[PDB]
Amino acid sequence: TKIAMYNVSPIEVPYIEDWAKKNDVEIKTTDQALTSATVDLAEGCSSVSLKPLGPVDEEVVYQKLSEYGVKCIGLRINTINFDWTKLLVTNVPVYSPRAIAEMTVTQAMYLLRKIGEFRYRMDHDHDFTWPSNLISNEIYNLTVGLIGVGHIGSAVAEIFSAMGAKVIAYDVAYNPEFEPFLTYTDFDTVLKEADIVSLHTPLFPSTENMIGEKQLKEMKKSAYLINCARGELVDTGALIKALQDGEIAGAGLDTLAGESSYFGHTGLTDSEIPEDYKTLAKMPNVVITPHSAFYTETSIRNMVQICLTDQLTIAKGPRSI
Amino acid sequence: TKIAMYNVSPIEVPYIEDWAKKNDVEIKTTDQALTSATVDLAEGCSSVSLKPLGPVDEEVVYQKLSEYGVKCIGLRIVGFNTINFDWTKKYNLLVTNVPVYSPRAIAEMTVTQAMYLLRKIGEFRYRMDHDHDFTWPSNLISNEIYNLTVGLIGVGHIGSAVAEIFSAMGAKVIAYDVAYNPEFEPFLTYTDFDTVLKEADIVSLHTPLFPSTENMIGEKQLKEMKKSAYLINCARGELVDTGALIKALQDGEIAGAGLDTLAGESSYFGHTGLTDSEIPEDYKTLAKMPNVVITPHSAFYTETSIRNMVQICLTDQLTIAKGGRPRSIVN
Amino acid sequence: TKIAMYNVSPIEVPYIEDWAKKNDVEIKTTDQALTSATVDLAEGCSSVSLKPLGPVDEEVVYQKLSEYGVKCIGLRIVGFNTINFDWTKKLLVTNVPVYSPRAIAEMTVTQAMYLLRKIGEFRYRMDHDHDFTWPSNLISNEIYNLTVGLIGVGHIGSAVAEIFSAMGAKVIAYDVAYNPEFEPFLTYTDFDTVLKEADIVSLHTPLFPSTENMIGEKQLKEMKKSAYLINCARGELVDTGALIKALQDGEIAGAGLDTLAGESSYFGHTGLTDSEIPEDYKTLAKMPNVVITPHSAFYTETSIRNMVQICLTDQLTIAKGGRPRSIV
Amino acid sequence: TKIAMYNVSPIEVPYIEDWAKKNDVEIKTTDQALTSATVDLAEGCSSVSLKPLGPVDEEVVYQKLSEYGVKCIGLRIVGFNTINFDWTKLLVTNVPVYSPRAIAEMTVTQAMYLLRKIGEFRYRMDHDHDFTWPSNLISNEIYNLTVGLIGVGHIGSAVAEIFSAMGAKVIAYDVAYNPEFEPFLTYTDFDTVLKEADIVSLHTPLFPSTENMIGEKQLKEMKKSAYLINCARGELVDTGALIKALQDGEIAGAGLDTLAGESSYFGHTGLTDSEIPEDYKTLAKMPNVVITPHSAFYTETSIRNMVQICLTDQLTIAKGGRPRSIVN
């Protein structure tokens, strides 16, 4: 059984070759996205694997898939026109909840200890003193609020509750197994009571700009906001006003609305990076990361490996569909 | 029953009045140092309490103290170097300190720096802001903490608290202490110094500072660490030979470092209006490094810490007034 | 809208009356099973709700159901096998898949800690020998120096892992399927190794034909003499004869059971003759290194609350042409 | 540098031998108390180690020890009442902290066993032949419960870390404040602990002022559903009061490792019926009580630490150290 991969980064490669040899399956690979110009590669292959940057719109790819004997298209992570697939599609539902959870916790502790604000005082004003307004506090004294909790949210809960924190959380769906770690309550209560706020809901039209002005005047003025989920969840401009006028204490971001413009690219001009970004990046009580929350060996390993072993069971007869 | 308080900063005040209500003790307060000028205020007090900025230099102070009948000089800090003890025995004067005030403050700073470094955060921001580069390079992939072993040198209040925390998160904690405490076995495994350095993905210092501990971390010790590993010092600068740490980072002996305290820190931390002349190249060299984070000995700086420095001090002195001797007494 | 409930227990009532006054919904109830007779109360209902002990084997029930404009049968348990599914082509079926993982994880843990401390063994020497000494063969250990092994790890296996891991024990586990969300709490490994290394072996696979009698002689001899076997899963995972033999010979050090092969005769029954109660129960039950409970791992307020509320909320969702995921 | 050891038991033997072997000391041993016949063994030795059952009250032994030229009496327990300090005039060292988690774990174990009603169920199964689930034997998940500690030291705090990890709310009364401890518990007053906890655990030391600290008034103050755990010291509880409160439904059950008046039979065999007390028998017959014979301490770790902390203390003595274990 032969497999054909697409969109591969050099970092995915080692784990690919480790699976290739471990499951004793022939694998062919390439960094380029799957097109009509690269379908020729899935010859013999029991499956094609993608990790798409973009839509695979043109439909003759599918024609060639089922003509070549490909049983399945397996993603490593909606980019698939599902109408044309009537081939089996698969995804990678879960790669490392702890990855994004750990980034979340990290950004929140950095801000809490107000490290960014101290380094500014130190480096620009040359002020190595301890001001009344920069006092910090222990994590167990705080109560954390989560807007949306799934695989990523719950890992965040287990960690903070473990550190002694009260976690309170709003989700439209009751999972009982989470009760050891958090108290379910309403949206507003979460915003009102929480010293750290972490976004973990999905992205839908209804959820776009979930967080804007109201919310921020509504947060504790001493609260920090954490978004390791999707930039479209936050009204960015709103955030920027909120921060300036001090309606929150800080924000930690792994993502911003319109991030695809510059996240993932290199060698940009001052002109190609947006001012809202440039403005936040400059705030000592903010931290931004280039959507890197997902980026651990475990994430990489599981993005490749889950999909290939799946792909092996499809060259014979799993839940990923 | 009366206590005189010195060196009070605004920030202590609410814990001060708070404690004075909780216990029914009368408190006189001042933001000034204890000297010949101000010893007056100790009148009819059982104890004075300080958070000193310098030696208590004047014999007169101690004499006039035991002459008022002040039983004890309570410090609101661990440090008692600022007290002349020849003279505290000469005047039959007790001295107390606050040795333990908020271990989780520091353990939490420790963890925070570890995690920040581990997620390469400062290194991404660098690529972002200065090379205008937002890609994920190969060498900046991170790992989850439950896959790592964290290594403590010195396991005291702070060390064990680091252990309970990183252990709560599933990391393996190994540690070297000269002293065995069964209390800590649920959270760490004791090993030897050499091994802690050798096996650890994170090395965190928590031994006290002695002559026998000055420069405990040096060239040989940074050579023995992993290329991948991070050095954390939220303990004391003097544990680290700074030049050596610089050399190690530059030479890629280790991957990064988190510092709350520096050797020779005492001449710049907690100063303002410094001009480049008065801040060292030591600190400058470390601070431009994306894989280094430095805080200004702020590991302790939480409301719990401040509060406890007030209240632990004041109840220690209240029990001295009552005729007790608290273990906070310095001998 | 209307929902009718059968198999209701006194304990369920408050939680139900709460969902009821909360959702603006009529609920009519009865302690007795769904049948030819009692189908008559499902009139006008969007749904019925069951917690059955027998198959609902009468066709008439189903037909009169689709006759009343009843949309769904919602089980308040996991096991939907008490439904004939051919006839449900008339009718939707929902279940309550997860209600308290932790209820069972905490029973599991309690029984382990109890044997590990040898309290039943001590009370035996105190009460029968008038002996209050402390013998060599009764020394115990701290949980963090022991390694806990899981055969099968689901919602329950992971909750258990979470707890033990949190107390500082090492956890190993065998599951046919890989779940990344469990790595902070356990290490995956092979079946054999779970048995060979563990000090406590707990079972959390599901009952299947290919799984019936998972634990027999081979496996018990392979466990550590000092190990403890926990079954808070399903009795049929364990061959009672083999278990009895092993405990008797010292091939394992003890066992905690909430469940037993054959248990249906007597679990759930009162006023029993000594005949009505089988000898293997009485034999394990006479042993001080055994603890047994009557299939109440599940039994907490959280489980009752959630078994009622999840199922009703699902029924409402289906009363509004919703389709919550507990469609079966 | 040679050591004499007294009171050794079969289980200690191995850690003794492994430590003498690891540190190059010779040790001599004997199972009887140190008195004036066996003192003859401590000749040439730099220190002794006992684990006493009753007072060393012979003066020959003290001055014969300082004649043989021994420097300290190392105890392998916390309890020093047995050494006479008039006669030590000789240093005395004890072993103050040997395995907090051993006691904290018995505390937790007993607490979970109670909380899950395994004893009450065992009674209904074995005496009533009743294998059903009653309303009063509904149980609860630990994270929904709150744990109150009277007294918080090495042990009470270890109990706190454990219950905190499981997600319970922990609260404690102590006369002293321990910053190290705020992550696991919240300090408060005595009344409040009794008033709000679903489990009460005793961890205060025994002092004249603490004798009968939990008695009639305090038990009326606890909740009908609360359990009392005493893995601390029996004289802390008024057994009469406790028995009668259990009888009246003032509390829901209790878990005990120690009893006011235990030293008559705990650690003995084989008593007559007259020799095991009425109170004990009353409690032991209560399915909602659990009683272990002061085995809370009794682990591998504990035995080991008792031996090795004492011997190494004694070795730092022979080379001229004066370790903090010195009690004068």
PDB file of C-alpha atoms in Angstrom, chain B residues 160-235:
ATOM      1  CA  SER B 160       9.100  22.035  47.238  1.00  0.00           C
ATOM      2  CA  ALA B 161       6.456  24.491  46.085  1.00  0.00           C
ATOM      3  CA  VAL B 162       7.927  24.398  42.602  1.00  0.00           C
ATOM      4  CA  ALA B 163       7.843  20.641  42.862  1.00  0.00           C
ATOM      5  CA  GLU B 164       4.153  20.451  43.883  1.00  0.00           C
ATOM      6  CA  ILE B 165       3.296  22.784  41.044  1.00  0.00           C
ATOM      7  CA  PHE B 166       5.179  21.195  38.138  1.00  0.00           C
ATOM      8  CA  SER B 167       4.138  17.776  39.488  1.00  0.00           C
ATOM      9  CA  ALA B 168       0.505  18.865  39.462  1.00  0.00           C
ATOM     10  CA  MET B 169       1.121  19.441  35.753  1.00  0.00           C
ATOM     11  CA  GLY B 170       2.622  16.009  35.330  1.00  0.00           C
ATOM     12  CA  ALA B 171       6.313  16.831  34.893  1.00  0.00           C
ATOM     13  CA  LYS B 172       8.950  14.622  36.505  1.00  0.00           C
ATOM     14  CA  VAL B 173      10.768  16.563  39.256  1.00  0.00           C
ATOM     15  CA  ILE B 174      14.182  15.485  40.471  1.00  0.00           C
ATOM     16  CA  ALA B 175      16.079  17.313  43.096  1.00  0.00           C
ATOM     17  CA  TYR B 176      19.264  17.691  45.094  1.00  0.00           C
ATOM     18  CA  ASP B 177      19.149  18.835  48.703  1.00  0.00           C
ATOM     19  CA  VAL B 178      21.658  18.264  51.396  1.00  0.00           C
ATOM     20  CA  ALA B 179      18.683  17.543  53.589  1.00  0.00           C
ATOM     21  CA  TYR B 180      16.118  14.721  53.456  1.00  0.00           C
ATOM     22  CA  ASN B 181      12.420  15.668  54.044  1.00  0.00           C
ATOM     23  CA  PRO B 182       9.986  12.780  53.707  1.00  0.00           C
ATOM     24  CA  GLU B 183       7.313  15.484  53.322  1.00  0.00           C
ATOM     25  CA  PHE B 184       8.466  16.046  49.712  1.00  0.00           C
ATOM     26  CA  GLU B 185       8.429  12.521  48.239  1.00  0.00           C
ATOM     27  CA  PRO B 186       4.959  12.782  46.772  1.00  0.00           C
ATOM     28  CA  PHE B 187       6.191  15.593  44.525  1.00  0.00           C
ATOM     29  CA  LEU B 188       9.851  14.925  43.627  1.00  0.00           C
ATOM     30  CA  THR B 189      12.602  12.367  43.604  1.00  0.00           C
ATOM     31  CA  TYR B 190      15.863  13.127  45.391  1.00  0.00           C
ATOM     32  CA  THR B 191      19.066  12.625  43.410  1.00  0.00           C
ATOM     33  CA  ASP B 192      22.631  13.903  43.324  1.00  0.00           C
ATOM     34  CA  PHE B 193      23.749  17.222  42.063  1.00  0.00           C
ATOM     35  CA  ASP B 194      25.523  15.862  39.113  1.00  0.00           C
ATOM     36  CA  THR B 195      22.469  14.015  37.959  1.00  0.00           C
ATOM     37  CA  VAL B 196      20.096  16.906  38.447  1.00  0.00           C
ATOM     38  CA  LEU B 197      22.277  19.016  36.165  1.00  0.00           C
ATOM     39  CA  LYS B 198      22.711  16.193  33.642  1.00  0.00           C
ATOM     40  CA  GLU B 199      19.108  14.859  33.289  1.00  0.00           C
ATOM     41  CA  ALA B 200      17.179  18.118  33.561  1.00  0.00           C
ATOM     42  CA  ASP B 201      15.300  20.035  30.853  1.00  0.00           C
ATOM     43  CA  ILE B 202      14.930  22.817  33.390  1.00  0.00           C
ATOM     44  CA  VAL B 203      17.254  23.555  36.253  1.00  0.00           C
ATOM     45  CA  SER B 204      15.910  25.744  38.994  1.00  0.00           C
ATOM     46  CA  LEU B 205      18.005  27.025  41.810  1.00  0.00           C
ATOM     47  CA  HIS B 206      16.714  27.114  45.360  1.00  0.00           C
ATOM     48  CA  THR B 207      19.683  26.659  47.734  1.00  0.00           C
ATOM     49  CA  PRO B 208      20.510  29.397  50.257  1.00  0.00           C
ATOM     50  CA  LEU B 209      23.535  31.690  49.772  1.00  0.00           C
ATOM     51  CA  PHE B 210      26.760  30.758  51.566  1.00  0.00           C
ATOM     52  CA  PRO B 211      30.466  31.168  50.749  1.00  0.00           C
ATOM     53  CA  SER B 212      30.187  27.491  49.964  1.00  0.00           C
ATOM     54  CA  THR B 213      27.487  28.316  47.473  1.00  0.00           C
ATOM     55  CA  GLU B 214      28.772  31.403  45.848  1.00  0.00           C
ATOM     56  CA  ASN B 215      29.208  30.671  42.173  1.00  0.00           C
ATOM     57  CA  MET B 216      27.684  27.260  42.606  1.00  0.00           C
ATOM     58  CA  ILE B 217      26.680  27.483  38.969  1.00  0.00           C
ATOM     59  CA  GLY B 218      29.703  28.016  36.813  1.00  0.00           C
ATOM     60  CA  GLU B 219      31.330  27.021  33.568  1.00  0.00           C
ATOM     61  CA  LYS B 220      31.690  23.395  34.432  1.00  0.00           C
ATOM     62  CA  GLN B 221      28.079  23.352  35.592  1.00  0.00           C
ATOM     63  CA  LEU B 222      26.690  24.980  32.465  1.00  0.00           C
ATOM     64  CA  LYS B 223      28.769  22.556  30.285  1.00  0.00           C
ATOM     65  CA  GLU B 224      27.050  19.651  32.088  1.00  0.00           C
ATOM     66  CA  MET B 225      23.483  20.871  31.248  1.00  0.00           C
ATOM     67  CA  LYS B 226      21.532  19.971  28.092  1.00  0.00           C
ATOM     68  CA  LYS B 227      21.788  22.069  24.970  1.00  0.00           C
ATOM     69  CA  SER B 228      18.007  22.209  25.270  1.00  0.00           C
ATOM     70  CA  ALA B 229      17.786  23.156  28.920  1.00  0.00           C
ATOM     71  CA  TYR B 230      16.846  26.363  30.694  1.00  0.00           C
ATOM     72  CA  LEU B 231      18.464  27.798  33.800  1.00  0.00           C
ATOM     73  CA  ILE B 232      16.124  29.400  36.314  1.00  0.00           C
ATOM     74  CA  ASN B 233      17.336  31.509  39.194  1.00  0.00           C
ATOM     75  CA  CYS B 234      14.574  33.003  41.265  1.00  0.00           C
ATOM     76  CA  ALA B 235      16.745  32.581  44.297  1.00  0.00           C
TER      77      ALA B 235
END
